[PDB]
Amino acid sequence: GVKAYELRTKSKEQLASQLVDLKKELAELKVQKLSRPSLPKIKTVRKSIACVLTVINEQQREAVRQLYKGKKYQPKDLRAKKTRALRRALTKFEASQVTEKQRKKQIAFPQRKYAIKA
Amino acid sequence: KKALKVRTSATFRLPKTLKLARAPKYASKAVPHYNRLDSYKVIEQPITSETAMKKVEDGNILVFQVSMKANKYQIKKAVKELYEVDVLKVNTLVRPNGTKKAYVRLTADYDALDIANRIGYI
Amino acid sequence: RQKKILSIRLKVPPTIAQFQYTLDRNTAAETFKLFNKYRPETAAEKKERLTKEAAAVAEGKSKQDASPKPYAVKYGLNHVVALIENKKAKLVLIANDVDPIELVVFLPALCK
Amino acid sequence: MAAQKSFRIKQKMAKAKKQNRPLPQWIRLRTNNTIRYNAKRRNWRRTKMNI
Amino acid sequence: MGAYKYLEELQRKKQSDVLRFLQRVRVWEYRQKNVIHRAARPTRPDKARRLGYKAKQGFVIYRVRVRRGNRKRPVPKGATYGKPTNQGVNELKYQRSLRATAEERVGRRAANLRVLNSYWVNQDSTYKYFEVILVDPQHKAIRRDARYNWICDPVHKHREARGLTATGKKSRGINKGHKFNNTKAGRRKTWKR
């Protein structure tokens, strides 16, 4: 049948060939209309047609992510990272940066943390 | 000190009576997005009815079920590629189904009857 | 009418209202006393070459801790006012063309 | 033309007619619970398809 | 103090003359220019600095113009409809300041920014002029500096509507202590006790 694992092992050429067979086979299930049946292959072909499109989209993201790790990029990867405006608002990020420098240093000093420490 | 003649002379050469220039535009850099290829299957099923068959015999005319973001150009291209027939006129109809009836008129170079036989419709 | 054939100031309304009033801003006023006087270009020009040479004269100089100058030039209205009060400054320059006027205003009196 | 021609409107009124149809035998049969009188049923003279 | 003190001094004055010429001429510019005027420079450096104005990216100074007078209330011609205590068109005044209305208008136009700040700077007759500091939260310059860093946090957004600004605190009657004061912790806070 089709399993997700088989599609991944297949090539970019090979899955495209699958999508082509899948449309033909779905098309024949159109013709076989006069009955009822014919579908336990279309519901599952609908799932197959979705799996093959997903798996390619995923392959292209990963490949893109490798090519771009080297360079500079990222409006698209940016959208996944935040997961919008609020979680974005919670950033810049603000936290280490805020106390990155004044007056803390004086305040204190630690031989003291160690000395006590057991 | 007293003031300049692209500024003085030009003004002697108008009374407005517009400017004129134009000024530039690249793409900058941080990259945008969209690659897509998203694709509708225009032809959805052949319609199958008693009236459809007579239109096959009588005037050489297929009856397809089409998308509601179909047009007539889309259908003409779609039949041409997948069925190698050249299509001469395309009729597009709303249905109370919520779907599209297309009566698609074909060339006598390949009669409608045996085009139809391999993706059957009655 | 030809009867040759214009200038923008002479009949024509816009480009801009505001600059025109700006020009007016300087020429007119009422007024209680501000600022005026002296700068033919000659007297400026000697002072302007002597200020570029005031910076350019720089050594001052690659060894030390203590290590004598030649040059100090400091720009900016705040630095200038402080150095006068410190009495270090040998000679200052002020620009006539300052707007808002009230930035430069302190120095002519202060330096005297 | 006519009537009422607007493409968008036409579809909504058409779409609604199909939505107002009788049930399929089967849902009574695999069954949930319900003396299954659809309810949505819309009517010849009476009521109004909706303002 | 050093430069600023002179400029600041001139401000105290304002019927009075070196400031007074500048401003009288500036009134002319002011009437021509729009409700929105963004400006590179504080006509105020003295007040602006204490204002936390520092020259650095994201910072703007902006001039705003608000009308002077009392209040006028709708609906004329069809006057209410209530007992005489309710009644007031001109009788009533805004409780909010003219300064505070100017901040809300400026922030409204410049959606991107949040107001730090309001300073008052020319009176003519018909108009009141306020020069507003608005600060970019979003960028890294304002963020990297600790002194400014507070503006950025999501709670501060729309501070001027919220009344968190120095003027907003002032118009609550907040300052700062005890009796004068008690119901300033908030207006709604007494909560009909």
Next chain:
Amino acid sequence: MGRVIRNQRKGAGSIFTSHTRLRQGAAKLRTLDYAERHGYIRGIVKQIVHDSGRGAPLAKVVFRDPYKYRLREEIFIANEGVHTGQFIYAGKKASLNVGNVL
């Protein structure tokens, strides 16, 4: 007290105004290039057309005088005795004839 009285209804509102668009216009008197020592404004009345806006006639005059700006035309106010084919001059050195503007 009242309902609103008629005077107060004039106020504004569509029932009060004129049908401004059926009006041809104004017919204000132009603003001289200069001179007008005879016929740098030369008009010929070509027609007389009623104004519904004052229940009196207008005279269509054209006006042909040059430049870039030039300004010309339109419907100036008709006087008694003014007619099609009669000349109009509008300005300082115009002749003192009925229909001429100065």
Next chain:
RNA sequence: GUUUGACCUCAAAUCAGGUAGGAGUACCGCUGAACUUAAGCAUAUCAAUAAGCGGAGGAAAAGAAACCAACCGGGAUUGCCUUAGUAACGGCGAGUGAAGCGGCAAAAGCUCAUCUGGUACCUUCGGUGCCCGAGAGGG
């Protein structure tokens, strides 16, 4: 008299980068009623209520004294408690109505008046390499 290259102020474009508008129940900032109460009523009351508008967050809002005070001491800010139906308001009619303190929950004091952008490099809240624009004092 006359122009040309350059300095800065205002403007318009442009694409890039960055963010906002809207929303979720109530909580949470302004403008602002009435019947009702006083057995009428007009101040007062209802009520700074409801509503309307603006707008934020997961809490918000307030905060280290130009405070308190009626002494001699306290020592930032909320809330809780009670001060108290006290002071005070008021046809001094009806009604309205605190605070300081005392002590609790919980605690914290500080901070103002080279930066960024570009490209390269990496282990990408960072830094390096470059280019570009802009409480204080003496020994």
Next chain:
RNA sequence: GUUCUUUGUAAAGUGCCUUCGAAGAGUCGAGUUGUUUGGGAAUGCAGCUCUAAGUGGGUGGUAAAUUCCAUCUAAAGCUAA
């Protein structure tokens, strides 16, 4: 609990010496008109008008001499629980 590693410099305590600014104006304050408040000559805020000083100044429930008492530095800001 274990592990890496830069110089330092300047800060800070304790004690001697003089001394002193980063300290915010149409603000403080006033009248005349409001509305709000428990706030009463004495709440807070708006508006119009007018308008200080600079270690001088503000507060201490009406307003005015003094020494001084007793307290605190507005017209700026942030901030966990």
Next chain:
RNA sequence: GAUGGGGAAGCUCCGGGCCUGAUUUUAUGCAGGCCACCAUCGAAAGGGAAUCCGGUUAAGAUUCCGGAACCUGG
């Protein structure tokens, strides 16, 4: 009624764009020249580019078809 500016916190409310020439026939590409009062929407019955004859369906038709014609754009 989009649409300065201005009241109103606010809801709310009134009052350059166009055409090119070196190249070249692919349109790339450098460089120059004009001009007034500006958007869209608003009548399926204002105005408007072009089609009729009959034949056929259970249910369409000046649409499809058989013949014949015509238009619009580029």
